[PDB]
Amino acid sequence: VENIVNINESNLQQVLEQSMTTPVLFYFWSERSQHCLQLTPILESLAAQYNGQFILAKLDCDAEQMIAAQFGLRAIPTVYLFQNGQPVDGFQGPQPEEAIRALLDKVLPREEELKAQQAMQLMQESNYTDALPLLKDAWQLSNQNGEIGLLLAETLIALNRSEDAEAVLKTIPLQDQDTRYQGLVAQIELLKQAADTPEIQQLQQQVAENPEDAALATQLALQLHQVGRNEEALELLFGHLRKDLTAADGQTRKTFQEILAALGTGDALASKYRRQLYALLY
Ligand SMILES: [Ca+2]
Numbered sequence: 001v002e003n004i005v006n007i008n009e010s011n012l013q014q015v016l017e018q019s020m021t022t023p024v025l026f027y028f029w030s031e032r033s034q035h036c037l038q039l040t041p042i043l044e045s046l047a048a049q050y051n052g053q054f055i056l057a058k059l060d061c062d063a064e065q066m067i068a069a070q071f072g073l074r075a076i077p078t079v080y081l082f083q084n085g086q087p088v089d090g091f092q093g094p095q096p097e098e099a100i101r102a103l104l105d106k107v108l109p110r111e112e113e114l115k116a117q118q119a120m121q122l123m124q125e126s127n128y129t130d131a132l133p134l135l136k137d138a139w140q141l142s143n144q145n146g147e148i149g150l151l152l153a154e155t156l157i158a159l160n161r162s163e164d165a166e167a168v169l170k171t172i173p174l175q176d177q178d179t180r181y182q183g184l185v186a187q188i189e190l191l192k193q194a195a196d197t198p199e200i201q202q203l204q205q206q207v208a209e210n211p212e213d214a215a216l217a218t219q220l221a222l223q224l225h226q227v228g229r230n231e232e233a234l235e236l237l238f239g240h241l242r243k244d245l246t247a248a249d250g251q252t253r254k255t256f257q258e259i260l261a262a263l264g265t266g267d268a269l270a271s272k273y274r275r276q277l278y279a280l281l282y
Contacts, residue, residue: 003047007059012067015057016085023054023107024082026090028073030061035094036077042097043079046104053108057082083107112141116148123151128158139168146176153184162191163231195227207236214240214247218255225259233259234273241280 005015007026015024027043029036047056061068061076071080080090081103089103109117115138119131135152142148149172156165166188172181203220210216217236224233237256240247247253256277263270 002044003050003052003054004044004056004058007057007067008064009067015055016082018055019082019085022052022083023104025054025056025104026071026080026082027056027058028061028068028071028076028078028080029058030076032062033076039077039094042100046097046100050104050108053114054104079103081107110142112138112145112148115141116151119151119155123155123158126158128155131155132159144171146172150176150180150184157184157187160228162188195229197223197227199223200227214244214252215249218248218252221259222255225262230259230263230269234269238273238276238280241277245281 005011007015018024025043025047027040029040043056047054059068059071061073071078075092077094078090078092079100080087082088088107091099091103115134119134119138122128122131122134131151132155135148135155139145139148139152149168153165153168153172156162156168165184169181169184169188200220200223203216203223207213207217207220217240221233221237224230224236234256237252237259240252241256245253256273260270260274260277265271
């Protein structure tokens with residue numbers, strides 16, 4: 001309905017009780033009035049611009065005289081803002097477009113809330129790829145608000161970015177560490193445990209004991225890669241390459257390159273490392 005309702009006998013109470021969550025801007029107007037002529041275009045174009053953020057509710061004062069008298073109407077035009085069932089602000093007369101913003105600006109949700117709401121819907125539709133940029137933006141804007149943090153972390157997990165999700169979960173304030181947080185943490189914990197293999201543990205010990213042995217570290221990097229611990233695998237190999245490009249008789253570089261190939265050109269971690277490798281080699 002372009003978010004504009006003409007009010008009559010049948011929809012006054014139904015929109016008065018729809019103000020319970022959606023802000024309603026009642027617009028008392030007349031086709032007779034020169035104040036309305038340049039308020040109406042300002043008002044409608046904001047209705048369509050905000051798209052369901054508020055309802056512009058027009059009451060034709062010539063057509064609906066009973067309802068207008070019951071509003072206490074004293075001038076045309078009059079606009080009143082209705083929320084939680086109740087009138088909360090308004091004005092009589094015509095006004096600049098930024099005056100009307102000021103009015104709207106108080107009651108309308110913040111950009112990060114709007115983005116978080118859109119992302120929540122996309123998450124519901126299992127569209128995590130599109131939720132992610134909105135959640136990144138909303139999280140930043142909100143100064144890393146914990147509830148948005150939880151959405152972002154869940155979205156990162158679904159996109160197989162558990163390390164990034166874990167970093168976001170580290171930021172969640174203690175008061176927000178409730179059932180949803182616990183569930184995400186438990187998921188990350190089980191993932192880390194599942195990737196913490198006996199074979200990796202004994203290689204990690206052996207590397208600790210002989211940190212210069214590039215062939216050992218390369219073995220370990222391979223087994224880390226195979227359980228998805230790529231940040232660790234690449235960091236470990238690259239450290240060896242920085243010391244010696246021919247490390248483990250060429251094998252360190254070869255394994256490093258083979259891992260980057262296996263991650264594919266769409267992987268952001270692999271892309272970082274490709275660029276670092278080129279600068280190192282040449
Ligand atoms: Ca260089």
